[PDB]
Amino acid sequence: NLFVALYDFVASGDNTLSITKGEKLRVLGYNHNGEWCEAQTKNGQGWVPSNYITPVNSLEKHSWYHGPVSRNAAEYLLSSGINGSFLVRESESSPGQRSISLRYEGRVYHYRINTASDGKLYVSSESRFNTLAELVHHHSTVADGLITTLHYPAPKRNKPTIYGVSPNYDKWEMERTDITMKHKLGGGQYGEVYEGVWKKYSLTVAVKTLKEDTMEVEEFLKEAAVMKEIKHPNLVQLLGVCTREPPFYIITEFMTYGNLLDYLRECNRQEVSAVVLLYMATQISSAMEYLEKKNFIHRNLAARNCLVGENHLVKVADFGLSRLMTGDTYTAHAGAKFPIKWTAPESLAYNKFSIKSDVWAFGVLLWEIATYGMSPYPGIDLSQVYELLEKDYRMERPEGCPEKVYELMRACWQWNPSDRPSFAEIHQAFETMFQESSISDEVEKELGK
Template sequence: MKNLYCFKQIYNNGKSERRLSLGEYKRAVSWSKYLVSSGAEIKGEGEGAWSADMSQLFIGNKFASGRHSRIYRGVYKQRDVAIKLISQPEEDENLATMLENHFTSEVALLFRLRHPNIITFVAACKKPPVFCIITEYLAGGSLRKFLHQQEPYSVPLDLVLKLALDIAHGMQYLHSQGILHRDLKSENLLLGVDMSVKVADFGISCLESHCGNAKGFTGTYRWMAPEMIKEKHHTKKVDVYSFGIVLWELLTAMTPFDNMTPEQAAFAVCQKNARPPLPPKCPLAFSHLINRCWSSNPDKRPHFDQIVAILESYSESLEQDAEFFTSYKPPTNHTILRCFPKLIAGRRSTSVKA
């Protein structure tokens, strides 16, 4: 079979192209030699439903990379996609096995997920020592990149609310499917051109029924719940903790614990119950929610059903009263009705779930 791959630099949906340099060509060949396949060769048990037709894949420029992966922009069956290539190290058999397990788990989870705030899975290729996961391409890049382009404390509160709601909706759906993300952070939240947010990167996610302790876990300390740092048993509430950190990021446009190394941040969180400092002018509505989300006691953290209800009530209140964030007063308990007295009058005949 000829011309299985066409390596291109893709800009602006193909409007501008250039030839690969010699160095880029050699790097492309070094990866492509593992990927060239007729398709039939890569279909093992259970893989037929998601196996990619590699003759339809065009790989363009790299736009992100991780410890063991590279992410490229590309085209698959005339659709803009992101292509995640995961390379197994030949010198470390244990790491190679772990990466293969992560790949298998990520594909299995992505294949079953369908939600506007979850990245859309397209196809995958399993051909050791390189694995390939193809998803939709989001032109807005990561939320972290967007925030780092802003001035500190400069993101408008209505945009903070919109972004937070998108993330919460995605996580609410994920948890409803019995899935823990376990690496929720701004880098794994992707933006569309309309500023919608989609949760991405399920490499270390797991079904709640299969998640045990966090021994040997490789998450990201700055966003990680204390029980995970301590390698203890964990539940869905670890994602709620991480959401609290992400909400802090939205309000500050800064990196949590940026004056510490990741290890120092982990020690401060576990041993000193430290959290990133809230902005002096942080609206009480947000500070109250954040403090609940990153509570050291997982049982005191709200579920995403509650978080969505709270944020939606904030949104409705803001539509009715532009000064909502300055007039908000924390509730005496955690029921939605008492959180939003201004809405009660208009909802006499409607029951509101706590």
């Protein structure tokens, strides 16, 4: 029953324990939701995140084994590699089905790993092995059917998200004196949000403070309440709150690269190619699929409200969320002012919002991504937007945008909200979109034309 650490973890919450990647551990038990476990190492005993470690008898211990990663995600991971960079992944839908993804001369080759009647694994029928590791080791020395050898495991660059800072049940409150406030973020577009350092861990964070005469208190507290319940890799994560006395604080993880809109407008388009844009759009759809299933609506989905972290990780800002049984409608009080270009027709006309109006906004966000941040509805005056949309006018396909991506945009922009796809359908559509050629290849066909 031994485990090995897959990522480094530094102790700071006094009941937590520091571990080093590759070190062995004995697990004693789990916390209330299984997300943390009490472990013993040669250095001590304490709580560590459960997914930062794995059984010594598990495939995850191998640097090249990335588990449940999709074909498209694999192409993103390997976009930063070289000839011979590779990884082994498993199908999320159908467990047990694995494939090798390998980079060679700027292209990624995908190979299904076959299993014989006696359980042996192989890519080439002439070379079968008892275990996955033996198969990889064999192809690490001779290509034997593959375009080239498997030489460089794709790095696992991102530590798994930890939903909070403690293994204990509800321990959100923290000491304001342990927070050093720094400069405001976003030039004020997000309100009173500042970069800060959480001394106790010398950890950089984002802090929203309830200064007098700004946000209404009930609103601020509801936001804090909602955020305690949100747990998804692509939604900004809450780390703590200071609600014992003013100024109230909401403290979250810090996204280092700012918002997606600015990132796309200022990026190196060589580095941030179509496979990277697809990777980011997919992450956003995953976050929205979660809100959809958890009965929340966003109402402000746009690239300026998506934040970018390391290795193109993208998280949707989750301030302002509203609780709404998925299928019901939320009505805004007349007079509410909305960002017209991202607002669905039923919202513009009747102030009605639902997860379907978020689907419409996602379509506009997808167009912003595909254009590297262009302002929507170019060549059109806002006063005529609703009228034009009613006549079935929709933005034109962005230069180089693959046809299937634009069709998804058009599905999101169906006039009747019930005709639009769900976020579950949208996420699944991205994952199955380029199965017989890469997005890179499709962009080519679109341009060459």
